[PDB]
């Protein structure tokens with residue numbers, strides 16, 4: 250049980266040891282397609298690739314590769330697409346995937362520039378007057394509106410399939426203060442953001458899977474998804490004792506390597522889930538508390 254286990258690991262200092270065990274046991278499947286010579290310029294990191302069995306395939310005969318995996322949580326009944334931050338040459342691919350997979354929401358847990366590095370291309374329009382057109386995949390993207398908060402921004406976008414003139418609204422959730430290789434300021438600010446994603450309907454089973462990305466699509470993205478899945482499992486059974494975080498984390502790693510980069514990110518997962526359980530189990534006031542504590546205004 251997660252709260253006694255958390256106090257146990259903390260009391261010792263075995264978060265490094267605990268975290269390492271996950272790396273030692275994680276699933277190791279082939280990533281043949283991602284390692285093909287022609288896809289070298291489609292991967293941001295040499296050591297972070299999608300497994301062939303769970304990779305998202307683009308619907309085009311030319312090259313159907315994109316560095317993204319489909320994390321399908323059977324028991325929880327919720328899917329995500331975890332992908333790397335789009336490269337200058339893969340933004341078209343990125344939006345093709347969003348469209349083909351019927352995604353309604355896109356979560357961005359990083360900033361374009363972190364520690365002096367360009368962690369992600371500017372794949373979305375920053376001003377309504379200047380929409381973006383991806384000639385390679387034939388899609389248009391327009392900024393419709395945005396709600397800027399102290400540490401995250403929510404953008405309303407419109408994606409048009411230029412070929413069929415079809416249109417869809419895409420909600421963009423940009424967490425701007427989650428440090429790379431780090432953890433959120435507090436469980437409150439994290440959960441406030443997550444619930445913002447939840448309340449938008451983007452995680453609904455009536456849409457395609459939500460697309461989640463930071464830079465490599467495994468560290469911060471993994472932390473976010475693990476916390477969401479754990480709270481969902483718990484929710485489905487209304488029994489926080491039946492949720493084994495490490496077990497579910499392992500299960501997520503069958504669909505994409507390296508989910509959760511650091512021992513502290515894992516420690517924070519526990520933290521976030523433990524706090525989120527309050528809401529899951531009936532506490533109707535915590536939500537607002539999180540909003541206050543997050544200082545979004």
Ligand SMILES: O=C(O)COc1c(C(=O)O)sc(-c2cccc(NC3CCN(S(=O)(=O)Cc4ccccc4)CC3)c2)c1Br
Pocket residue numbers: 272273274275276277278294296297368428429430431463464465466467468469470506507508510
């Ligand atoms: O968002 C963040 O918090 C940080 O984001 C980032 C980055 C960023 O924002 O700059 S770079 C990065 C990164 C890049 C290359 C390799 C590894 N790390 C390796 C470690 C070992 N693993 S693994 O998956 O544990 C290896 C393995 C594969 C299958 C089975 C067992 C082990 C692969 C990635 C990490 C991560 Br994540």
